[PDB]
Amino acid sequence: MAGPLSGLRVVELAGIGPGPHAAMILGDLGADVVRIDRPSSVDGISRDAMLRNRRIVTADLKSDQGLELALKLIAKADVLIEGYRPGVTERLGLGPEECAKVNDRLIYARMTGWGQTGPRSQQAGHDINYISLNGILHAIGRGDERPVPPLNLVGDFGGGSMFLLVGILAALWERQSSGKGQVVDAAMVDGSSVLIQMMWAMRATGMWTDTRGANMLDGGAPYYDTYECADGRYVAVGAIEPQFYAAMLAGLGLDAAELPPQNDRARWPELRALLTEAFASHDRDHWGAVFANSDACVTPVLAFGEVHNEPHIIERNTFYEANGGWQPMPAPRFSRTASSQPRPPAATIDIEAVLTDWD
Amino acid sequence: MAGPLSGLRVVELAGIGPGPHAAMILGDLGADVVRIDRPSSVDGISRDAMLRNRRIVTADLKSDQGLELALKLIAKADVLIEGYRPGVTERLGLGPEECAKVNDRLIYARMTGWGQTGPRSQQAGHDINYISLNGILHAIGRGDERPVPPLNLVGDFGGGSMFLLVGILAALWERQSSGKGQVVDAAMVDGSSVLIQMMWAMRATGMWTDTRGANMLDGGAPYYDTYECADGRYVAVGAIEPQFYAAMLAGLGLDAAELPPQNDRARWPELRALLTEAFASHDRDHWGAVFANSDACVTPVLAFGEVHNEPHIIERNTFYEANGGWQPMPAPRFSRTASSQPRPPAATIDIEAVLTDWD
Ligand SMILES: C[C@H](C(=O)SCCNC(=O)CCNC(=O)[C@H](O)C(C)(C)COP(=O)(O)OP(=O)(O)OC[C@H]1O[C@@H](n2cnc3c(N)ncnc32)[C@H](O)[C@@H]1OP(=O)(O)O)c1ccc(-c2ccccc2)c(F)c1
Ligand SMILES: C[C@H](C(=O)SCCNC(=O)CCNC(=O)[C@H](O)C(C)(C)COP(=O)(O)OP(=O)(O)OC[C@H]1O[C@@H](n2cnc3c(N)ncnc32)[C@H](O)[C@@H]1OP(=O)(O)O)c1ccc(-c2ccccc2)c(F)c1
Numbered sequence: 001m002a003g004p005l006s007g008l009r010v011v012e013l014a015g016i017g018p019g020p021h022a023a024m025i026l027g028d029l030g031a032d033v034v035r036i037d038r039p040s041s042v043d044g045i046s047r048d049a050m051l052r053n054r055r056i057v058t059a060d061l062k063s064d065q066g067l068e069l070a071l072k073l074i075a076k077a078d079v080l081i082e083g084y085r086p087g088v089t090e091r092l093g094l095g096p097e098e099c100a101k102v103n104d105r106l107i108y109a110r111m112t113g114w115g116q117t118g119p120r121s122q123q124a125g126h127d128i129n130y131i132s133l134n135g136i137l138h139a140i141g142r143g144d145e146r147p148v149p150p151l152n153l154v155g156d157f158g159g160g161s162m163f164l165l166v167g168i169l170a171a172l173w174e175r176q177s178s179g180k181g182q183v184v185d186a187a188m189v190d191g192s193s194v195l196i197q198m199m200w201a202m203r204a205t206g207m208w209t210d211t212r213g214a215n216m217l218d219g220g221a222p223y224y225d226t227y228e229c230a231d232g233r234y235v236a237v238g239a240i241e242p243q244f245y246a247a248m249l250a251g252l253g254l255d256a257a258e259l260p261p262q263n264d265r266a267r268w269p270e271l272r273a274l275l276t277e278a279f280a281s282h283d284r285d286h287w288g289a290v291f292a293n294s295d296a297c298v299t300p301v302l303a304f305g306e307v308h309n310e311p312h313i314i315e316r317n318t319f320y321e322a323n324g325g326w327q328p329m330p331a332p333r334f335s336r337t338a339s340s341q342p343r344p345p346a347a348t349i350d351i352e353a354v355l356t357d358w359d
Numbered sequence: 360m361a362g363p364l365s366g367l368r369v370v371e372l373a374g375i376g377p378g379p380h381a382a383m384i385l386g387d388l389g390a391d392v393v394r395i396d397r398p399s400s401v402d403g404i405s406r407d408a409m410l411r412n413r414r415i416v417t418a419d420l421k422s423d424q425g426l427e428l429a430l431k432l433i434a435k436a437d438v439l440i441e442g443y444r445p446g447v448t449e450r451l452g453l454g455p456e457e458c459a460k461v462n463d464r465l466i467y468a469r470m471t472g473w474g475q476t477g478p479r480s481q482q483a484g485h486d487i488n489y490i491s492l493n494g495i496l497h498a499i500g501r502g503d504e505r506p507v508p509p510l511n512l513v514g515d516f517g518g519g520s521m522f523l524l525v526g527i528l529a530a531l532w533e534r535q536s537s538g539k540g541q542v543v544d545a546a547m548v549d550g551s552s553v554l555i556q557m558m559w560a561m562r563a564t565g566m567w568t569d570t571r572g573a574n575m576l577d578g579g580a581p582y583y584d585t586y587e588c589a590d591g592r593y594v595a596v597g598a599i600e601p602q603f604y605a606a607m608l609a610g611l612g613l614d615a616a617e618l619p620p621q622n623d624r625a626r627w628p629e630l631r632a633l634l635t636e637a638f639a640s641h642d643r644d645h646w647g648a649v650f651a652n653s654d655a656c657v658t659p660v661l662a663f664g665e666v667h668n669e670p671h672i673i674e675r676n677t678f679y680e681a682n683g684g685w686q687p688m689p690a691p692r693f694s695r696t697a698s699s700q701p702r703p704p705a706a707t708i709d710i711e712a713v714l715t716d717w718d
Contacts, residue, residue: 124654176535182696219507318549
């Protein structure tokens with residue numbers, strides 16, 4: 001098995017969202033990932049490409065057979081991932097304390113939104129709920145309209161799975177000294193807060209307000225936003241640095257002497273109007289050619305369906321093909337122990353065959 | 360120094376956005392982090408709380424002495440972080456190959472947007488550009504309107520710093536059974552593509568389209584979006600599961616029989632108008648009360664300035680007071696080797712002291 005996480009052994013109690021995203025990445029980078037699903041689901045070879053780099057096993061954890069078999073895998077493994085409400089693994093008998101008695105080396109990785117304790121710890125929820133509570137959602141969208149969710153990028157993955165991964169991998173580094181595993185409490189409401197630490201920093205020094213659509217990076221600056229082109233398609237402008245902004249103006253055919261200053265906020269209405277008219281006068285692909293190889297920080301806003309035809313995407317193999325759809329190649333990349341193409345989801349396996357192979 | 364990464368040694372070449380964020384989290388979790396800035400920059404004590412859990416040192420890396428000193432740090436350290444355009448560290452004489460001469464154990468962590476090679480590798484950019492190229496930005500915002508940047512959470516941090524971190528720590532694990540460092544190439548256009556893997560999975564199986572504002576999680580579903588309340592503040596609804604959905608309807612006072620099906624997409628506009636009217640009839644805090652302890656997946660949308668007054672936030676100490684105002688405490692959390700409250704930015708110490716301190 002290729003990649004820097006070769007040899008690493010992982011048990012994943014099937015959940016949804018962050019939990020599997022974490023497990024995917026571990027798999028992506030070489031880990032040996034065993035996913036225990038309930039039998040009352042699972043029905044053929046799985047259609048979710050998120051379950052790549054996986055051995056799947058069926059096992060009723062309610063039965064005593066299930067519990068014990070599960071408990072054998074955990075013994076022989078480096079990491080457990082579960083993303084159920086607090087108390088669930090306990091009441092199954094797969095809790096931390098039960099695991100620490102068949103394997104004090106275990107990294108016990110707990111993926112929630114709200115955390116292991118406190119008032120909301122038992123409430124159901126999704127990405128949008130966790131980011132609603134910590135100020136993040138309120139900051140996303142245009143100022144005249146209600147917040148718009150940034151898909152489930154910021155809560156599930158960015159501030160969820162990714163911190164689960166860091167916690168796991170930081171705990172493995174710790175286990176090189178002490179010789180003992182530990183419990184990783186990854187909560188989306190907390191990870192996503194660290195994810196947005198920049199804004200908390202800027203907020204402190206007067207450089208970010210709570211007004212949506214009126215900051216440097218939320219779309220309120222005319223030089224950090226998208227623009228509609230002649231064809232109804234869009235470009236992105238991120239020309240924050242004055243040298244890049246100048247390069248942009250020259251490409252647009254606008255003379256700096258006719259525009260307000262870039263950072264005179266009181267005149268952002270005029271500036272935006274000027275730039276809006278400029279970008280609207282030609283189509284996206286025009287602006288794409290004009291600015292390629294430029295530091296003007298203008299790029300086409302591609303739809304998923306067009307990503308596969310973008311040269312820079314093609315040449316770095318950011319994507320690969322797999323069953324009438326492209327999928328991202330693993331990330332990040334490693335010089336010596338490179339990852340492989342992910343293996344597609346693998347038809348179920350007996351939990352016995354695995355306990356054998358593991359020896 | 361408290362945390363799972365106690366006595367991990369990290370050298371950070373000063374940049375902006377992802378590189379500093381990754382360095383922060385390493386700090387956050389105990390690591391020994393020395394940030395080499397350029398002498399022209401530092402005035403007093405840097406007011407960016409992202410520069411917490413660091414020692415700051417100056418050094419003209421273009422002088423002969425500045426270089427020599429920096430290579431002496433790197434020789435002693437475990438990880439180097441640089442976030443410059445490709446070729447830049449090579450020309451300073453801090454390239455991977457130069458660093459491998461003085462320390463074949465070093466984890467060499469390169470944080471870019473576009474990657475190390477390819478047609479856009481020398482192009483300036485920011486978050487909004489990296490996510491324009493790979494389908495992500497196109498997918499965010501309302502349908503009748505131009506795409507909206509999700510601040511810089513998805514390229515810089517979610518798809519950026521966090522993948523640098525996963526790569527640094529995965530490579531430390533690999534070192535444990537090889538004796539050798541290696542180069543981690545973390546490109547925001549890659550990380551952010553993996554971060555959004557779920558959408559790519561979903562489009563493969565016909566469950567996501569490239570139309571903005573028309574999907575389960577982009578704000579087009581009436582049970583996954585925000586709603587304006589009577590006082591002009593907002594709630595978030597995330598009631599995907601039919602049971603959570605049904606719970607929400609009952610708390611709204613809405614009879615399931617009068618409404619269109621939850622997932623009849625042709626009738627979503629009609630469903631949203633009924634839900635809109637219901638949520639508009641009371642204020643945000645009213646709904647927060649009504650749905651507490653509920654599985655209805657309905658939460659207040661708090662602005663940054665209100666987050667310190669939220670019970671669930673206060674009681675789990677997700678934030679700590681400092682300086683101007685609040686900041687996020689470390690994530691994720693660890694049972695045995697717990698992180699400590701971040702130390703503010705450490706006024707410029709001199710590089711020789713650090714070398715004494717490290718042997
Ligand atoms: C965008 C969106 C996301 O944001 S995903 C993130 C959602 N939040 C979390 O993940 C945080 C923590 N977890 C939870 O809050 C709960 O997990 C749920 C999901 C709320 C409720 O689930 P629940 O149905 O109440 O389940 P519980 O966790 O409370 O308990 C589970 C029950 O199952 C039993 N058992 C587990 N394994 C077995 C087994 N092998 N055999 C037998 N029983 C088993 C437990 O014992 C327990 O039973 P009980 O307590 O009743 O006794 C999102 C993202 C992606 C998708 C998606 C997309 C495409 C395809 C599929 C999914 C999505 F739909 C939503
Ligand atoms: C939302 C937004 C973000 O997305 S942050 C992410 C921006 N993207 C990246 O990070 C991708 C990789 N990097 C680059 O693409 C380039 O780094 C830039 C940034 C385009 C600048 O181009 P540049 O100014 O040309 O710099 P280069 O990388 O080309 O080279 C730097 C030169 O400096 C020299 N030297 C470095 N260290 C030293 C030293 N110690 N002593 C002497 N010289 C040094 C190098 O030698 C090199 O020299 P050269 O080869 O040119 O002669 C974002 C987020 C946050 C902020 C923000 C917010 C508040 C306050 C401040 C910033 C923001 F503005 C934007």
